[PDB]
Design a binder for these strands. Structure first.
Length: 73
RNA sequence: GUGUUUAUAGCCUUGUUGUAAUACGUCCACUGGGGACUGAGGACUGCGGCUUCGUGCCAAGGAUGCUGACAUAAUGGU
């Protein structure tokens, strides 16, 4: 079952490399930020740290009830 | 109101105080963001750049990667 049974149009070597996301200078860790979409739209939450593209964000769960969540920048 | 010549304002002209600054024109193989449309091709060759050299890496002969939602729905057609 292993030998290719068809033309096997193997994709050409694509010269695309993964590089780190350049987030905005204003999305530093610790800055208060307003959520725009999702079930928690309109809430204000604190940016703990930046993931590769998203921001690991949370409002103090005793304050606005927004748990440890990810948010797209 | 008449005539004045810095008076208790100063104006213009002239050379002139250390030089300038700015605007406009032009150029940078200088640089930082925002938006939109496209992804044709399909092993490898090539031209280049990094790299002490690299079955090396790269934005260099055309898009890839990471995710999320749905079968009783989603999406489109008539």
């Amino acid at each position: 079952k292993y030998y290719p049974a068809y033309r096997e149009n193997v994709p050409k070597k694509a010269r695309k490399a993964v590089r780190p996301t350049k987030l905005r200078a204003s999305l530093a860790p610790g800055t208060v930020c307003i959520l725009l979409a999702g079930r928690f739209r309109g809430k204000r939450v604190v940016v703990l740290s930046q993931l590769e593209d998203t921001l690991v964000v949370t409002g103090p769960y005793k304050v606005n009830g927004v748990p440890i969540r990810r948010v797209n920048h």
